[model samples]
Target: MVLSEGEWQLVLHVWAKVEADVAGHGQDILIRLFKSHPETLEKFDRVKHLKTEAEMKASEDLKKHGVTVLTALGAILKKKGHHEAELKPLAQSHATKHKIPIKYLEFISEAIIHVLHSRHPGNFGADAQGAMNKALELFRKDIAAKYKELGYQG
Candidate 1:
């Protein structure tokens, strides 16, 4: 189920919004993720602790920098340039870590948008599917790039 460019654009917009929200939650999300999703604790715990601590402040700084990078990448999706090229491998690696194909990353991005919108209605507004299309588009490209990098075109 490939996404249209419009669909991707909608998702990216939602992502930009949700990233702001999630990144704002910062260490708190790490805490909730660790406690609520204990099944994935082993996978996330070390990163989570590193996230919510002064000692791992560099991790936090890096995260902030990453947020800016992704957000900028979201804006430049129409361009054929180094930024998109840079994002490709990173997205692929993340998909590998989650044991999910990059092809399905749009769905995950949309899910995050939906969940965040639900949690903070006043902040996210009601556009919904439209709001998330752009983010979805960027996410799809990232996933596809991963699949390509892995030599799994399908």
Candidate 2:
């Protein structure tokens, strides 16, 4: 649950580079997640009707939702140092209202890392990935615990 200063700097360096096109990366990340778990689309109200890649790609509502997630993570990376205290409220809301499962967030995390690697292969080295993994897991595990705290099985 710890990331070195170098790891944080490296990951944030890549993040800053990719921060320009929030909407674009968000789409790619979400598409990656949906491609792996099509059922995840059912969880997003705006995208519930989008069952195909082309359909999902064309939906503005889904893209906005992607931005929601992307910006939320971005701010968390910058402001909170990956603290799950910032994430618990969203986790609670998602669990109570959307009934989101941890696996879905894991899928999103995977897609995000994939997007980062694919976008900037030169800078985002193994160490960067390692740092990002630990940081993301820190937030994710907190959400999992929050879900459990609420007795939400998911």
Global fold similarity of model 2 (TM-score): 0.91
Q: Estimate each model's TM-score.
A: 0.45, 0.91
Please give the lDDT score for candidate 2: 0.83
Clashes of each: 17, 0
Q: What is the C-alpha lDDT of each candidate?
A: 0.49, 0.83
After the best TM-score superposition of candidate 2, give how far the Cα of residue 19 lies from its true spot, in angstroms. 0.9
Q: Give me the displacement of residue 55 in model 2, in angstroms.
A: 1.9
Q: What value does the lDDT take at residue 18 in candidate 1?
A: 54
What shift in Å separates residue 4 of candidate 2 from its native position after superposition? 1.8
